[PDB]
Structures are given as structure tokens and as C-alpha cells.
Coordinates of C-alpha atoms and ligand atoms in Angstrom, one line a residue:
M23 CA 8.0 60.9 -27.6
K24 CA 7.6 57.1 -27.6
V25 CA 5.0 55.1 -25.6
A26 CA 5.3 51.3 -25.1
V27 CA 2.3 49.3 -24.0
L28 CA 3.0 45.8 -22.5
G29 CA 0.0 43.6 -22.8
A30 CA -1.3 45.0 -26.1
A31 CA -3.0 41.8 -27.3
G32 CA -5.6 41.7 -24.4
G33 CA -8.9 43.6 -24.4
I34 CA -7.5 46.5 -22.4
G35 CA -4.3 46.7 -24.5
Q36 CA -6.1 46.8 -27.9
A37 CA -8.5 49.5 -26.6
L38 CA -5.6 51.4 -25.1
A39 CA -3.5 51.0 -28.3
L40 CA -6.5 52.2 -30.5
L41 CA -7.1 55.3 -28.5
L42 CA -3.4 56.2 -28.3
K43 CA -2.9 55.7 -32.0
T44 CA -5.7 58.3 -32.5
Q45 CA -4.9 60.7 -29.7
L46 CA -1.1 60.8 -29.3
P47 CA 0.4 64.1 -30.6
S48 CA 1.9 64.1 -34.1
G49 CA 5.4 62.7 -34.3
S50 CA 4.9 60.2 -31.5
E51 CA 5.8 56.6 -31.6
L52 CA 3.8 53.7 -30.3
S53 CA 5.2 50.2 -29.6
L54 CA 3.0 47.3 -28.8
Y55 CA 4.2 44.2 -26.9
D56 CA 2.5 41.0 -25.8
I57 CA 3.3 37.3 -25.7
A58 CA 0.6 36.4 -28.3
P59 CA 2.0 36.4 -31.9
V60 CA -1.0 38.4 -32.9
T61 CA 0.6 41.5 -31.4
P62 CA 2.6 42.6 -34.5
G63 CA -0.6 42.3 -36.5
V64 CA -2.5 44.5 -34.0
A65 CA 0.0 47.2 -34.8
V66 CA -0.2 46.6 -38.5
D67 CA -3.9 47.0 -38.3
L68 CA -3.6 50.2 -36.3
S69 CA -0.9 51.3 -38.7
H70 CA -3.5 51.8 -41.4
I71 CA -5.2 54.6 -39.4
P72 CA -4.1 58.0 -40.9
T73 CA -2.5 59.6 -37.9
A74 CA 1.0 60.8 -37.6
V75 CA 1.9 58.2 -35.0
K76 CA 4.4 55.4 -35.9
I77 CA 3.4 52.0 -34.6
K78 CA 5.1 48.6 -34.5
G79 CA 4.3 45.4 -32.7
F80 CA 6.4 42.7 -31.1
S81 CA 5.7 39.3 -29.6
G82 CA 7.5 36.5 -27.8
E83 CA 9.3 36.3 -24.5
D84 CA 11.6 39.3 -25.0
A85 CA 10.0 42.8 -24.7
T86 CA 13.3 44.6 -25.3
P87 CA 12.6 45.6 -28.9
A88 CA 9.4 47.3 -27.9
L89 CA 11.1 49.1 -24.9
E90 CA 14.0 50.7 -26.9
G91 CA 13.7 54.4 -26.6
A92 CA 10.5 54.2 -24.6
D93 CA 9.6 57.3 -22.6
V94 CA 6.4 55.9 -21.1
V95 CA 5.8 52.2 -20.4
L96 CA 2.1 51.3 -19.8
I97 CA 1.8 47.7 -18.4
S98 CA -1.7 46.3 -19.1
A99 CA -0.8 42.6 -19.2
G100 CA -2.3 39.9 -17.1
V101 CA -5.8 38.8 -16.2
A102 CA -8.7 41.0 -15.2
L103 CA -5.7 38.1 -9.2
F104 CA -2.4 38.3 -7.2
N105 CA -1.7 34.6 -7.9
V106 CA -1.3 34.9 -11.7
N107 CA -0.5 38.6 -12.1
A108 CA 2.3 39.0 -9.6
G109 CA 4.7 37.0 -11.8
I110 CA 3.8 38.8 -15.0
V111 CA 4.3 42.2 -13.4
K112 CA 7.6 41.2 -11.9
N113 CA 8.8 39.8 -15.3
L114 CA 7.8 42.8 -17.4
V115 CA 9.1 45.4 -14.9
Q116 CA 12.4 43.4 -14.8
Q117 CA 12.8 43.9 -18.5
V118 CA 12.0 47.6 -18.2
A119 CA 14.7 47.9 -15.5
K120 CA 17.3 46.6 -17.9
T121 CA 16.2 48.4 -21.1
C122 CA 14.7 51.9 -20.4
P123 CA 15.3 52.3 -16.6
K124 CA 14.4 56.0 -16.5
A125 CA 11.1 55.8 -18.3
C126 CA 7.7 56.6 -16.7
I127 CA 6.1 53.4 -15.7
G128 CA 2.3 53.2 -15.4
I129 CA 1.0 50.0 -13.9
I130 CA -2.5 49.1 -15.2
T131 CA -2.4 45.4 -14.1
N132 CA -4.5 44.7 -11.0
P133 CA -4.5 44.5 -8.1
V134 CA -2.9 47.9 -8.6
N135 CA -2.7 48.4 -4.8
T136 CA -0.3 45.4 -4.7
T137 CA 1.3 45.3 -8.2
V138 CA 2.8 48.8 -7.8
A139 CA 4.6 47.7 -4.7
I140 CA 5.9 44.7 -6.6
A141 CA 7.1 47.0 -9.4
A142 CA 8.8 49.3 -6.9
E143 CA 10.6 46.4 -5.2
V144 CA 11.7 45.0 -8.5
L145 CA 13.0 48.4 -9.6
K146 CA 15.0 49.0 -6.4
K147 CA 16.6 45.5 -6.7
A148 CA 18.0 46.8 -10.0
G149 CA 19.2 50.0 -8.3
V150 CA 16.9 51.9 -10.6
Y151 CA 13.7 52.8 -8.6
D152 CA 12.6 56.4 -8.9
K153 CA 9.4 57.1 -7.0
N154 CA 8.7 60.0 -9.4
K155 CA 8.4 57.6 -12.4
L156 CA 6.1 54.8 -11.1
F157 CA 2.4 55.3 -11.1
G158 CA -0.6 53.1 -10.5
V159 CA -3.3 54.0 -13.0
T160 CA -6.4 54.8 -11.0
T161 CA -8.1 57.0 -13.6
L162 CA -11.0 54.4 -14.0
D163 CA -12.2 55.5 -10.6
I164 CA -12.0 59.1 -11.7
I165 CA -14.1 58.8 -14.9
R166 CA -16.6 56.5 -13.2
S167 CA -17.1 59.1 -10.5
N168 CA -17.7 61.8 -13.2
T169 CA -20.3 59.6 -14.9
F170 CA -22.2 58.8 -11.7
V171 CA -22.1 62.3 -10.3
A172 CA -23.1 64.0 -13.6
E173 CA -26.0 61.5 -14.0
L174 CA -27.2 62.2 -10.5
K175 CA -27.0 66.0 -10.7
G176 CA -28.0 66.4 -14.4
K177 CA -24.6 68.0 -15.4
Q178 CA -22.7 67.4 -18.6
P179 CA -20.4 64.4 -18.0
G180 CA -17.4 65.9 -19.6
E181 CA -17.6 69.0 -17.3
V182 CA -17.5 67.1 -14.0
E183 CA -14.2 66.2 -12.4
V184 CA -14.2 64.7 -8.9
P185 CA -10.8 63.9 -7.2
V186 CA -10.4 60.3 -6.1
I187 CA -7.7 59.4 -3.5
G188 CA -6.6 56.3 -1.6
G189 CA -6.1 53.0 -3.6
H190 CA -7.6 51.0 -6.4
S191 CA -9.3 48.3 -4.3
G192 CA -13.0 48.7 -3.4
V193 CA -12.7 49.9 0.2
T194 CA -9.6 51.9 -0.7
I195 CA -11.3 54.0 -3.4
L196 CA -12.2 57.4 -1.8
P197 CA -14.0 59.9 -4.0
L198 CA -13.7 63.4 -2.6
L199 CA -17.3 64.4 -3.4
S200 CA -17.1 67.4 -1.0
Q201 CA -14.5 69.0 -3.3
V202 CA -16.5 69.1 -6.5
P203 CA -17.1 72.7 -7.5
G204 CA -20.7 73.8 -8.0
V205 CA -22.2 70.6 -6.6
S206 CA -23.5 69.7 -3.2
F207 CA -24.7 66.2 -2.1
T208 CA -26.8 65.1 0.9
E209 CA -25.2 62.7 3.4
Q210 CA -27.2 59.8 1.8
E211 CA -26.2 60.9 -1.7
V212 CA -22.5 60.7 -0.7
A213 CA -23.0 57.3 0.9
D214 CA -24.8 55.9 -2.2
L215 CA -22.3 57.5 -4.6
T216 CA -19.3 56.2 -2.7
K217 CA -20.5 52.6 -2.6
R218 CA -21.4 52.6 -6.3
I219 CA -18.0 54.0 -7.2
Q220 CA -16.3 51.4 -5.0
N221 CA -18.3 48.5 -6.5
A222 CA -18.5 49.8 -10.1
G223 CA -16.4 46.9 -11.4
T224 CA -18.8 44.2 -10.1
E225 CA -21.5 46.1 -11.9
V226 CA -19.8 45.3 -15.2
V227 CA -18.7 41.8 -14.3
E228 CA -22.3 41.0 -13.4
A229 CA -23.8 42.5 -16.5
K230 CA -21.3 40.6 -18.7
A231 CA -22.3 37.4 -16.9
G232 CA -18.7 36.2 -16.6
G233 CA -17.6 37.1 -20.1
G234 CA -15.0 39.6 -18.7
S235 CA -14.6 42.8 -16.7
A236 CA -14.5 46.5 -17.7
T237 CA -12.0 46.4 -20.6
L238 CA -13.0 49.4 -22.8
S239 CA -13.6 52.0 -20.1
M240 CA -10.3 50.8 -18.5
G241 CA -8.6 51.3 -21.8
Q242 CA -10.2 54.7 -22.0
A243 CA -9.0 55.4 -18.4
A244 CA -5.4 54.3 -19.2
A245 CA -5.5 56.3 -22.4
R246 CA -6.4 59.5 -20.5
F247 CA -3.6 59.0 -18.0
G248 CA -1.2 58.1 -20.8
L249 CA -1.9 61.3 -22.8
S250 CA -1.8 63.4 -19.6
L251 CA 1.8 62.3 -18.9
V252 CA 2.8 62.7 -22.5
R253 CA 1.5 66.3 -22.4
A254 CA 3.5 66.9 -19.2
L255 CA 6.6 65.2 -20.6
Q256 CA 6.4 67.7 -23.5
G257 CA 6.5 70.7 -21.3
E258 CA 2.8 71.3 -21.0
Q259 CA 2.0 73.1 -17.7
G260 CA -0.9 72.7 -15.2
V261 CA -1.3 69.0 -15.9
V262 CA -2.8 67.5 -12.7
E263 CA -3.9 63.9 -12.5
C264 CA -4.5 61.6 -9.5
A265 CA -2.4 58.4 -9.5
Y266 CA -1.2 55.7 -7.0
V267 CA 2.4 56.6 -6.2
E268 CA 4.9 56.4 -3.3
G269 CA 5.0 59.8 -1.7
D270 CA 5.0 61.4 1.8
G271 CA 3.9 58.3 3.6
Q272 CA 1.5 60.3 5.7
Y273 CA -1.1 57.5 5.2
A274 CA 0.8 54.6 3.5
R275 CA 3.9 54.0 1.4
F276 CA 1.8 54.1 -1.7
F277 CA -1.2 56.4 -1.9
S278 CA -3.3 57.9 -4.7
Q279 CA -3.3 61.7 -4.5
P280 CA -3.3 64.7 -6.8
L281 CA 0.0 64.9 -8.8
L282 CA 1.2 67.9 -10.8
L283 CA 3.1 66.2 -13.7
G284 CA 6.2 67.6 -15.1
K285 CA 9.0 66.6 -17.6
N286 CA 10.5 64.0 -15.2
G287 CA 7.3 62.4 -14.0
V288 CA 5.6 63.8 -10.9
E289 CA 6.6 67.4 -10.3
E290 CA 4.7 68.1 -7.1
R291 CA 2.5 66.0 -4.8
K292 CA -0.4 68.3 -4.1
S293 CA -2.4 68.0 -0.9
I294 CA -5.6 66.0 -0.8
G295 CA -7.3 69.2 0.5
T296 CA -10.1 69.7 3.0
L297 CA -12.0 66.5 3.8
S298 CA -15.5 66.1 5.0
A299 CA -16.5 64.2 8.1
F300 CA -17.5 61.2 5.9
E301 CA -14.3 61.4 3.8
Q302 CA -12.0 61.5 6.8
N303 CA -13.7 58.5 8.4
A304 CA -13.5 56.5 5.2
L305 CA -9.8 57.4 4.8
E306 CA -8.9 56.2 8.2
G307 CA -11.0 53.0 8.2
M308 CA -9.4 52.0 4.8
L309 CA -5.8 52.5 5.7
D310 CA -5.4 49.0 7.2
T311 CA -6.4 47.3 4.0
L312 CA -4.1 49.5 1.9
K313 CA -1.1 48.7 4.1
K314 CA -1.7 45.0 3.8
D315 CA -2.2 45.2 0.0
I316 CA 1.2 47.0 -0.1
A317 CA 2.9 44.5 2.3
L318 CA 1.6 41.6 0.1
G319 CA 3.6 43.0 -2.9
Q320 CA 6.7 43.8 -0.9
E321 CA 6.9 40.3 0.5
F322 CA 6.4 38.8 -2.9
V323 CA 9.7 40.2 -4.1
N324 CA 11.5 40.1 -0.8
Ligands
AG429 AG1 9.3 59.6 -18.7
AG430 AG1 9.8 59.9 -16.0
AG431 AG1 -8.4 62.3 -7.6
AG432 AG1 -7.1 64.4 -9.6

């Protein structure tokens, strides 16, 4: 199995590449690509870590050498936004559609609500789009929910898993706090937890005082989703992760929901389950923003 990360020189890419080099199963290959000429040296530096993962870096305009034989392509390039990131997403996904068109594509570049629709429209212009292979990485909302819920209820952070559906934008992030096993929240606890999970990025941008956004936890989030897909792509069963994908269309063309992952991408789109009165109201009131964020990306290509 080979994983290619596009945007490896940035803060998210280097954290992503570091965690993958350490956590990818033995015999895996890791290709790093970015425009900055420092990228081959990022791989050389990571190549000194004693894990059975082959790593090589590439720079320049052409990402093809890094995409050769890629099973998973994680795109973390761009700034941490539609103005400057729409062109980078369209450019990189274009090269993916020519080199490894049947790879699993994970969009980390934000706004994920919009850039995944750009990637899909670019992929279908190449006659290549497979809605089972394109994922918007929303895992940062998952791990942020686990940290806040565990701190509130005094549980161990690694033993708390809350499902998050909807989109990646603030109002679109919907944590299903009613579905957490063994935990119950008051109606005010749900309100405070939901708003903190929806504004958790501003919490980091504010504390950094303009020096950047969440770059290490986002790398940790992209690494978790990357290894989950590699496990599924290796025949591992029961691998369930929530990701922003094009599915039923019951709420929007693209919607983050539980996904049973198999050897060809998503195996089954599991239901979002039973929703509380609060979660149902938040889902409906958010839909208008999600559809506009999707329409923005579709019109950019069309
Ligand atoms: Ag794949
Ligand atoms: Ag796939
Ligand atoms: Ag979820
Ligand atoms: Ag999930």
C-alpha cells in the first residue's frame, strides 16, 4: 500500500507525514509532494526514522512522480479561503485524475464543505469520478468532540467516541452527543458542547494570536483517517469512520455520515441513527448553508 500526501511541506503536511511514517503498517510506501523544494528533504529527514515504510519526496509543478502507484492520496495543500484554495485543489485533483484515477482521495484542504465539491466536479470532467473514493476529512471535529466530552464528564479521552455528521463549516458541524454510550448530557451541556465544537478552530487561531491555525491536531486528525482507510484497504473489517462524502442526497449532495470502509473505499453508508430534538433542529437549520457551500464549489468548475 502506498499513500501520497500533496502539500507535505506545510505545517499540516509535515505533521501528517511524520505520523504516517511512524504508524503506517510495515511494507507501506509514503510519497511526499509539495511545490517548495524543501519537500524531498522532508522525506529524507523522515527516512532516517527506523520504521519499515519507504518514503521519498518530490517538488516542483508536476506531482505525477509522487502519484505513481498511489492507493490513497491525501491533499493537505493550501492555506489554513475559497479565493486562494480553489485553484490549488482543482490543480492537484486534475493531476490525480490523470495519474492514479482509481485511488482513494481525501481532501484536507479547507473549506472542505466546498473543496470536495470542486474535487468531484473536476473528477467527473475527466470521466473518472467515483463517489466511493472521494472523502472530505472531518476527523478533526471527531477528536475535538472526544476531548471536550471526556474533559466535561471525567472520562478517559481515548475511550470516548462521539459521531459527528453534517459538514466541516462551523454551523454545519453536528456532534451527535445523544448517541454517546454511557454518557448523558443536560440540555445546556449539549448547547455549550455543540458551540465549542463548532468554534474550536477560532479557539486555536485566537490563542496563536495570528501565527496560524490548528496544524498539529489537524495532522493528527488526517493521520487517523489515513490509517483507517489503509486498514480497510488491507481487508480489515468493521472499520467505521465519519467523512464528508456524496451519498444518498437525503440532506445534501455531500454530507458527513458514518461510513463502513472496505477495499474499494466506502463499503456502506450507515444511517445517522436516532437524533434528539436538539440534533434534529440543528441538522435542518444548517442544511441551507451546506447546500450553498456545495453550490459554490460546483459553480467554480462549471
Ligand atoms: Ag483506494
Ligand atoms: Ag478507493
Ligand atoms: Ag461521526
Ligand atoms: Ag463516525
